[PDB]
Amino acid sequence: AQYEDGKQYTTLEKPVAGAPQVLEFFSFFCPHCYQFEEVLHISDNVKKKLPEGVKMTKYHVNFMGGDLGKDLTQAWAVAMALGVEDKVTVPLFEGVQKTQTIRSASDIRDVFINAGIKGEEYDAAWNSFVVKSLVAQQEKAAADVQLRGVPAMFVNGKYQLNPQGMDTSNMDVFVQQYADTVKYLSEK
């Protein structure tokens, strides 16, 4: 075949029922995730090739960066609740990995303030049970697939993308192969 289990993807031995169609996992501490967001724009290029009626979910994980890692998962919950993902993703990545100006929850908060979310609104979100259950969702979804590594993408809770088995000589070719694989798995 041209798409083979074990080459552009692997199959989950234990499929996850009721899982989001396209489920992607990242960490702001994760160097390939930085690449995936700012250099490759994976999420975006996958979207562009996905059918219609298909939903994309992106979750943060706890297992990198200890205490700050967990703060970042809660902050991403806040981002999802307020719908400001597209205004904080880049400054969070750059604050963690480029400038290294994010060292505490207060520093994470500054990123949001600077992005124009109001202080009051962020703190209220931060402390809300809606954000608590959204943190729970992030953890549960990660637990559902025994996640030990990011970046990761899962399609319909049964197939996991395998970027190691794609050519990396050309970054644009890598992205299209990645996106075309998601589409193929989608239609499976």
Side-chain angles (χ1 to χ4, degrees):
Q2 291 266 354
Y3 296 97
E4 288 169 325
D5 187 316
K7 190 197 77 179
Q8 299 105 325
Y9 68 98
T10 52
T11 302
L12 299 184
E13 308 196 329
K14 203 158 244 177
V16 178
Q21 295 175 275
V22 183
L23 190 39
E24 186 182 340
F25 289 99
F26 78 109
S27 168
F28 285 110
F29 279 94
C30 159
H32 285 142
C33 304
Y34 187 112
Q35 290 300 304
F36 267 40
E37 164 68 22
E38 291 190 13
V39 181
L40 301 182
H41 307 283
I42 294 287
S43 292
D44 202 80
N45 279 275
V46 168
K47 183 175 194 306
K48 294 196 293 75
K49 293 213 164 158
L50 286 177
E52 296 286 1
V54 66
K55 165 96 173 66
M56 291 179 70
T57 314
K58 169 133 81 199
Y59 289 157
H60 196 268
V61 293
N62 292 339
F63 63 77
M64 294 184 81
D67 225 305
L68 258 199
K70 282 199 84 166
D71 279 325
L72 282 164
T73 303
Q74 199 169 341
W76 188 247
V78 173
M80 284 184 295
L82 299 181
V84 294
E85 297 94 324
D86 297 344
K87 310 178 175 197
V88 295
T89 290
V90 165
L92 284 170
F93 265 119
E94 294 190 354
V96 179
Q97 298 185 50
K98 196 186 179 182
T99 59
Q100 279 190 8
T101 46
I102 288 170
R103 311 204 219 83
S104 65
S106 173
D107 296 340
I108 297 173
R109 181 172 185 278
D110 292 341
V111 166
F112 284 71
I113 301 299
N114 187 46
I117 293 87
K118 294 178 197 177
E120 177 43 41
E121 192 178 357
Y122 179 92
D123 300 341
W126 183 268
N127 291 290
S128 72
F129 288 87
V130 164
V131 157
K132 292 197 191 319
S133 63
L134 225 33
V135 162
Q137 288 171 237
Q138 288 182 99
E139 294 179 22
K140 174 162 176 307
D144 282 348
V145 299
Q146 229 163 15
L147 188 68
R148 93 176 76 83
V150 289
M153 188 180 296
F154 296 88
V155 181
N156 294 315
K158 243 197 149 147
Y159 306 104
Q160 179 186 351
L161 279 280
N162 181 44
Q164 284 116 0
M166 311 176 187
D167 194 333
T168 61
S169 57
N170 174 295
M171 330 181 81
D172 304 304
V173 171
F174 168 73
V175 177
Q176 289 332 311
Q177 185 181 359
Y178 195 101
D180 287 343
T181 303
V182 176
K183 182 174 185 288
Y184 158 81
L185 291 175
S186 194
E187 289 151 10
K188 221 174 165 71

